């Protein structure tokens, strides 16, 4: 109820943060099992703990562009769906 | 014949910005015709003119979640692909 592979590709954030997001993302699937819902709950949690503003996207077919402060970016596939997370401030 | 198409869904920004984004997005398709590139064009163009930070999303199957100040949020489908755009600051 926490362990999960998830492959990283656009690593750009503290190890703990990326690890927490990956693990936290896993819980999201088991708790919600929805790209939108998962991104919603996880986003708020990080904003409250680390401080806003975190942007999150999840799915498996979408092109996108966004800006973000240094060391505030992370991307990794998991649960047969691409996961994205990154704050800005 | 078609001009300024794209259907609105989450309107929340100056008419000019929303109309410019829709038209600007349309061009993007004509010049690139790729969801990924579409965001790149509209993103820098607006960030340069209106000033950052404009976030953009485009595809046909993806969950998204983000935060943004009032009077800076727009979403609309076009060219058989959903497009999203909104600045943050």
């Amino acid at each position: 109820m926490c362990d999960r592979k998830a492959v990283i590709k656009n690593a750009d954030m503290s190890e703990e943060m990326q690890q927490d997001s990956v693990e936290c993302a896993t819980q999201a699937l088991e708790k919600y099992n929805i790209e939108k819902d998962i991104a919603a709950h996880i986003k708020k949690e990080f904003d409250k703990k680390y401080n806003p503003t975190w942007h999150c996207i999840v799915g498996r077919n979408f092109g996108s562009y966004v800006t973000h402060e240094t060391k505030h970016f992370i991307y990794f596939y998991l649960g047969q769906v691409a996961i994205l997370l990154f704050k800005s401030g | 014949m078609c001009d300024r198409k794209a259907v609105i869904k989450n309107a929340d920004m100056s008419e000019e910005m929303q109309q410019d984004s829709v038209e600007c997005a349309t061009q993007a398709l004509e010049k690139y015709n790729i969801e990924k590139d579409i965001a790149a064009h509209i993103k820098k163009e607006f960030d340069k003119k209106y000033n950052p930070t404009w976030h953009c999303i485009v595809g046909r199957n993806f969950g998204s979640y983000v935060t943004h100040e009032t009077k800076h949020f727009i979403y609309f489908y076009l060219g058989q692909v959903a497009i999203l755009l909104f600045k943050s600051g």
């Binding site: 656009n10 077919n61 996108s64 990154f86 | -």
Partner: peptide, 17 residues
């Protein structure tokens, strides 16, 4: 500051993968 870029495959669906 750096602009993130991506362009996501039918990992799972009718064909299944």
């Amino acid at each position: 500051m750096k602009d993130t870029g991506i362009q996501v495959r039918d990992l799972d669906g009718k064909s299944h993968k």
